[PDB]
RNA sequence: GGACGCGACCGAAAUGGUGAAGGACGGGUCCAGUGCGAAACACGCACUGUUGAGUAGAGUGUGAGCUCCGUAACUGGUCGCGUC
């Protein structure tokens, strides 16, 4: 019953503002403190900001403190993180959390929402380009051959790989991205596959970039050599 | 002054049905307002424990929390396969709350050689001025691996970057991906490009190679 | 000896004024901590604390007691005097 949406979160540049939204349901959040916790990618959780119900009080992270404002509107059952003056290093996931009811789960966050991501760089917005991963002419490798899509110098985060609509999904790994020196991202998304049915097989990689409205569905197939 | 929050260890591998113990030390009183939470990939954390000791309403009873002193220890008597995931303390007895750096707890399995395969660039991406070669690392334990890029028989550094999958939900294994990044010119200077790995399922180091211009 | 009456001295419930005492005379208020109220602070309640707090009060009590100066009911005591 109890849920929280947080909405709001996209690129923004350095110097830039952006207000995030935190709303919720199954419960009412003028009886609750409500927070703001975030997590830089591959990082631990930080914690925000918070409003404490009744009074109003509000705290901040020093990392935070004097850019961000935390407000709740109670008509809307939905609290806000209003953020000036954003910085590359404000880049996360940004999750609003309810505090539990005190005689139930004392100061415990016992509730939180999916998460928005920020991404605060210079960076504009750009779709991937995607290139074959060929499976090799050679024999083997554990016992099949291997291929893939490298989905390459797209901005912000996130993209999707699927293979085959969604149809191919056994030995796929889709990696990780890596936010690369120039400062668009970059990942690989690989697949195991019998090496005897290369030429009768069809292997096509379906690519999303949102942001961007960049779809591409790459086939991939054996170089000719 | 901030309260510390020391968590340790910062990982951990453990069996099914293993009892594990996760440690978070406060640098100051903090009370018995702690909490702890797991966080799986992708996911919000869940609440797990508040006030140091007190399970939270419907979570199993295999997790418990303890204080000594300013000291803290979250335990899982027995693991179950869901219970694979990161662990993460938290201190909320005064503003601001502080989060200990995570435990990530991940599960043992037999050994497993990675597969390797090697891809060089496409035609297409070299007609746009720089040329990705991929080394992939396919379905390996433990995580530890070492592969490095040779061009020409010359050692390549910090012109590669490696990602690296979660362990996977059926077979526990990892997948690793190391990707070599050169300009057109330089790439077209060279011709045998390798990528060597080590690895504990290997009875010796794999090499994996291609000529330029062969294929 | 006794009783009644008058008066004086003493005592005295009660009352006005006075000036010292701080937590072992209290109450109030503040402060701290803990728990609670859908509640970390602010607000309210409860519990705990004076090796927590001014006897210049920082009180819409400086309230009770006392120190010290008066008024004083009397069912009080004593002495004198008048009378029986
Ligand atoms: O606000 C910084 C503060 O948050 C903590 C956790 O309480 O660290 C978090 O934020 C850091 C980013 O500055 C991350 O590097 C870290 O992984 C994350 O847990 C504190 O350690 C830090 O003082
Ligand atoms: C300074 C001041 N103290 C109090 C009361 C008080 C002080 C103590 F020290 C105690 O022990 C005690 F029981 C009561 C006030 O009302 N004010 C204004
Ligand atoms: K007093
Ligand atoms: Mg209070």
């Known amino acids: 019953e109890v849920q929280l949406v947080e909405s709001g979160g996209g690129l923004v540049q350095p110097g830039g503002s952006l207000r995030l939204s935190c709303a919720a349901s199954g419960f009412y959040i003028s009886y609750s403190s409500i927070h703001w916790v975030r997590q830089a990618p591959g990082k631990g959780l930080e914690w925000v900001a918070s409003i404490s119900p009744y009074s109003g009080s509000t705290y901040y992270a020093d990392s935070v403190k004097g850019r961000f404002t935390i407000s709740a509107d109670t008509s809307k059952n939905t609290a806000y993180l209003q953020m000036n003056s954003l910085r590359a290093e404000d880049t996360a996931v940004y999750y609003c959390?309810?505090?539990?009811?005190?005689?139930?789960?004392?100061?415990?966050?016992?509730?939180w929402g999916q998460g928005t991501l920020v991404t605060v760089s210079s960076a504009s917005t750009k779709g991937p380009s995607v290139f074959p991963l060929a499976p090799s002419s050679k024999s083997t490798s554990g016992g099949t051959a291997a291929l893939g899509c490298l989905v390459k110098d797209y901005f912000p985060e996130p993209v999707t790989v699927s293979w085959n609509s969604g149809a191919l999904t056994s030995g796929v790994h889709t990696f990780p991205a890596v936010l690369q020196s120039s400062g668009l991202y970059s990942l690989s998304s690989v697949v195991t596959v019998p090496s005897s049915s290369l030429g009768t097989q069809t292997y096509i990689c379906n690519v999303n970039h949102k942001p961007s409205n960049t779809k591409v569905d790459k086939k991939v197939e054996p170089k000719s050599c | 002054s901030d309260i510390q929050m020391t968590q340790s260890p910062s990982s951990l591998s453990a069996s099914v049905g293993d009892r594990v113990t996760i440690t978070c030390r406060a640098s100051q009183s903090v009370s018995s307002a702690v909490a702890w939470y797991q966080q799986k990939p992708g996911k919000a954390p869940k609440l797990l424990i508040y006030?140091?000791?007190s399970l939270y309403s419907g979570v199993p009873s295999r997790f418990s929390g303890s204080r000594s002193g300013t000291d803290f220890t979250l335990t899982i008597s027995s693991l179950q396969p869901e219970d694979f995931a990161t662990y993460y303390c938290?201190?909320?007895?005064?503003?601001?709350?502080?989060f200990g750096q995570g435990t990530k707890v991940e599960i043992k399995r037999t050994v497993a050689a990675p597969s390797v395969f090697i891809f060089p660039p496409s035609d297409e991406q070299l007609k746009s001025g720089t040329a990705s070669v991929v080394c992939l690392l396919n379905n390996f334990y433990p995580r530890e691996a070492k592969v490095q890029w040779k061009v020409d028989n010359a050692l390549q550094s910090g012109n590669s970057q490696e990602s690296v999958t979660e362990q996977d939900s059926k077979d526990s294994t990892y997948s690793l991906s190391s990707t070599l990044t050169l300009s057109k010119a330089d790439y077209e200077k060279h011709k045998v490009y390798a990528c060597e790995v080590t690895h504990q399922g290997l009875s010796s180091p794999v090499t994996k190679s291609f000529n330029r211009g062969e294929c």
């Open positions: 938290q201190q909320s007895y005064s503003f601001p709350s502080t």
């Open positions: 006030s140091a000791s």
């Open positions: 959390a309810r505090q539990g009811y005190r005689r139930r789960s004392g100061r415990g966050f016992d509730y």
